[PDB]
Enzyme design. Structure first.
Site, PDB file in Angstrom:
ATOM      1  N   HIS A   1       5.806   6.947   6.522  1.00 29.66           N
ATOM      2  CA  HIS A   1       5.616   6.640   5.112  1.00 29.66           C
ATOM      3  C   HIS A   1       5.094   7.682   4.531  1.00 29.66           C
ATOM      4  O   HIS A   1       4.922   8.871   5.133  1.00 29.66           O
ATOM      5  CB  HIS A   1       4.441   5.430   5.293  1.00 29.66           C
ATOM      6  CG  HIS A   1       3.156   5.682   5.932  1.00 29.66           C
ATOM      7  ND1 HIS A   1       2.988   5.697   7.274  1.00 29.66           N
ATOM      8  CD2 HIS A   1       2.181   6.579   5.268  1.00 29.66           C
ATOM      9  CE1 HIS A   1       1.640   6.455   7.443  1.00 29.66           C
ATOM     10  NE2 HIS A   1       1.221   6.639   6.317  1.00 29.66           N
TER      11      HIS A   1
ATOM     12  N   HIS B   1       2.255   9.164   1.083  1.00 25.29           N
ATOM     13  CA  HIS B   1       1.221   8.840   0.035  1.00 25.29           C
ATOM     14  C   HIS B   1       1.528   9.750  -1.231  1.00 25.29           C
ATOM     15  O   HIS B   1       1.949  10.947  -0.944  1.00 25.29           O
ATOM     16  CB  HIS B   1      -0.026   9.141   0.563  1.00 25.29           C
ATOM     17  CG  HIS B   1      -0.598   8.629   1.882  1.00 25.29           C
ATOM     18  ND1 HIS B   1      -1.373   7.436   1.667  1.00 25.29           N
ATOM     19  CD2 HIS B   1      -0.119   8.660   3.201  1.00 25.29           C
ATOM     20  CE1 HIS B   1      -1.436   6.957   3.211  1.00 25.29           C
ATOM     21  NE2 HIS B   1      -0.815   7.626   3.912  1.00 25.29           N
TER      22      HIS B   1
ATOM     23  N   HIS C   1       3.853  11.013   6.542  1.00 29.83           N
ATOM     24  CA  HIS C   1       2.934  10.604   7.696  1.00 29.83           C
ATOM     25  C   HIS C   1       4.184  10.181   8.826  1.00 29.83           C
ATOM     26  O   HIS C   1       4.776   9.048   8.562  1.00 29.83           O
ATOM     27  CB  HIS C   1       2.046   9.788   7.814  1.00 29.83           C
ATOM     28  CG  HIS C   1       0.743  10.418   6.974  1.00 29.83           C
ATOM     29  ND1 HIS C   1      -0.164   9.752   6.270  1.00 29.83           N
ATOM     30  CD2 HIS C   1       0.636  11.755   6.769  1.00 29.83           C
ATOM     31  CE1 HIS C   1      -1.082  10.580   5.626  1.00 29.83           C
ATOM     32  NE2 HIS C   1      -0.514  11.554   6.148  1.00 29.83           N
TER      33      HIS C   1
ATOM     34  N   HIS D   1       0.975  -1.405   0.163  1.00 25.90           N
ATOM     35  CA  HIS D   1      -0.028   0.075   0.170  1.00 25.90           C
ATOM     36  C   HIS D   1       1.045   1.128  -0.044  1.00 25.90           C
ATOM     37  O   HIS D   1       0.287   2.170  -0.368  1.00 25.90           O
ATOM     38  CB  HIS D   1      -1.058  -0.184   1.042  1.00 25.90           C
ATOM     39  CG  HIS D   1      -2.015  -1.052   1.006  1.00 25.90           C
ATOM     40  ND1 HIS D   1      -1.894  -2.176   1.936  1.00 25.90           N
ATOM     41  CD2 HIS D   1      -3.143  -1.446   0.061  1.00 25.90           C
ATOM     42  CE1 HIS D   1      -2.853  -2.965   1.752  1.00 25.90           C
ATOM     43  NE2 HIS D   1      -3.448  -2.623   0.717  1.00 25.90           N
TER      44      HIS D   1
ATOM     45  N   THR E   1      -5.914   6.810   7.878  1.00 24.63           N
ATOM     46  CA  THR E   1      -6.720   7.045   6.403  1.00 24.63           C
ATOM     47  C   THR E   1      -6.583   5.788   5.589  1.00 24.63           C
ATOM     48  O   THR E   1      -6.849   5.794   4.453  1.00 24.63           O
ATOM     49  CB  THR E   1      -5.621   8.197   5.742  1.00 24.63           C
ATOM     50  OG1 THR E   1      -4.221   7.582   5.494  1.00 24.63           O
ATOM     51  CG2 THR E   1      -5.566   9.623   6.672  1.00 24.63           C
TER      52      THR E   1
ATOM     53  N   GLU F   1      -3.144  13.641   0.953  1.00 24.02           N
ATOM     54  CA  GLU F   1      -4.317  13.198   1.606  1.00 24.02           C
ATOM     55  C   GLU F   1      -5.187  14.413   2.238  1.00 24.02           C
ATOM     56  O   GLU F   1      -5.985  14.703   1.790  1.00 24.02           O
ATOM     57  CB  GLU F   1      -3.963  12.180   2.742  1.00 24.02           C
ATOM     58  CG  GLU F   1      -3.557  10.893   2.249  1.00 24.02           C
ATOM     59  CD  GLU F   1      -3.884   9.609   2.941  1.00 24.02           C
ATOM     60  OE1 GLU F   1      -3.343   9.548   4.211  1.00 24.02           O
ATOM     61  OE2 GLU F   1      -4.462   8.904   2.239  1.00 24.02           O
TER      62      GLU F   1
HETATM   63 ZN   LIG Z   1      -0.593   7.598   5.992  1.00 25.09          ZN
END
Ligand SMILES: [Zn+2]
Ligand code: NA
Ligand SMILES: [Zn+2]
EC number: 4.2.1.1
Lengths: 259, 259
Positions: free
Chosen positions: B93, B95, B118, B63, B197, B105
């Site tokens: 990590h 996104h 994050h 992911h 999230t 996000e």
């Molecule tokens: Zn995250």
């Protein structure tokens, strides 16, 4: 692995360490005081529809033994009573003592029974058991006391297969078992909001505890005590006293369907 | 069997099927409207103590990729701001998007950044991350926007190792990484109560989103897009657009640390 049990080091007094909800507001079991439980004649009669119950297997999980059912359809359901909607039977299991004078999880005016049967159901509006356990109204457990007395014919099929699931992890085919044979004649009950009585102790259970015990013979319950908590080739630890003691009622009210 | 991701059929619009909390009251991320998020002078100064941070490994989880830290002691902690308690860094990590114009996000006045970092922390009092995620005050996630611009020296060590974790399940040793090198100069922030999230979308997060983005080069972020969602020997699906869009604020207030 993470684990728990009923011993000095991993037992109920220590469950709070990995499962902090153990000290929560709606924990089970509880003592039922028959002089303070509140009569509630708005409670409906319980509808136990088990005519198509389909048992599949019996297994020793290292804490008790479960008889599992096909819960893919409404074959064995609980409705009415204090419940809204339909609750499907997934499994039943027992808790029991090392001696006839203890073993139940709930108590009635502090009296302990020899064992207690839990028929575990989940609310079909959540789609599956896994979703249901995360909801306050996800499960309904029907609890039935076992008093030592006359043999229960309906329990005998269970007793006769225990020698094939002696140790943790053993399972056996267990088809065509009729759970109606474990019910008492009266469906009068107490009810209160609570939890699973084992880790993870989730507060997702509407408890329905029957007033009338079923009998079982001293020999039937003795067979439960010959099971093992341990796995095959490990040191023998007899599966006895796999009960959680009564927890504080806190702000809850226990209702009775009967006067 | 259960799967989620970011595709047309398993993506954010469908997560509610298996994870009904997706439609909860405190979901993340959210759009931060700088005209309505107000200064709150009761907020405490934010303390980021990362001088002893001990990174251990980097891994592709199918992911995103996570850089994991030793959280056995208070080596890398977040305190103050809106938090009560000490929060240990477990992992960071990102996104990111398929294009430079999307990938964050959180949004600020509906503006999307190229990516979002994050830094995930858990409240020491719960003993471990697993327990902490089950509590409303369990986690604190520091979110930092990545704007495409100059190369970030502090990110390069991460970029350099991505070719060794191309597919799901790959991991590599990743020691002595200094997460101070991913921080902007200002620690001004916005904060609100929210969730993870990604599934299971648990509402256990105090979000702290920094005002000031860090820069990432077009080439640095391009390297993130060459990762694969899939495992080795499975069809290649490039790891892009692994962001959840902004969710409804509902009854929450976003507070700003700055006037
Ligand atoms: Zn995250
Ligand atoms: Na806006
Ligand atoms: Zn039970």
């Amino acid at each position: 692995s993470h684990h728990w049990g009923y011993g000095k080091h991993n037992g109920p007094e220590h469950w709070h360490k990995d499962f902090p909800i153990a000290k929560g507001e709606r924990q089970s079991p509880v003592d039922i005081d028959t002089h303070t439980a509140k009569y509630d004649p708005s409670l409906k009669p319980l509808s136990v529809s088990y005519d198509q119950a389909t048992s599949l297997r019996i297994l020793n999980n290292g804490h008790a033994f479960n008889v599992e059912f096909d819960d893919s359809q409404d074959k064995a359901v609980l409705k009415g009573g204090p419940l809204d909607g339909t609750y499907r039977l997934i499994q039943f299991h027992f808790h029991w003592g090392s001696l006839d004078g203890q073993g139940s999880e709930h108590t009635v005016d502090k009296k302990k029974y020899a064992a207690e049967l839990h028929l575990v159901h989940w609310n079909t509006k959540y789609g599956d058991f896994g979703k249901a356990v995360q909801q306050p109204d996800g499960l309904a457990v029907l609890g039935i006391f076992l008093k030592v007395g006359s043999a229960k014919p309906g329990l005998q099929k269970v007793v006769d297969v225990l020698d094939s699931i002696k140790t943790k992890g053993k399972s056996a085919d267990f088809t065509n078992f009729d759970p109606r044979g474990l019910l008492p004649e009266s469906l009068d009950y107490w009810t209160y909001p609570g939890s699973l009585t084992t880790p993870p102790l989730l507060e997702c259970v509407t408890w329905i505890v029957l007033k009338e015990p079923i009998s079982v013979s001293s020999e039937q319950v003795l067979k439960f005590r010959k099971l093992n908590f341990n796995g095959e080739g490990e040191p023998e630890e007899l599966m006895v006293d796999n009960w959680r003691p009564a927890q504080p009622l806190k702000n809850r009210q226990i209702k009775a369907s009967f006067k």
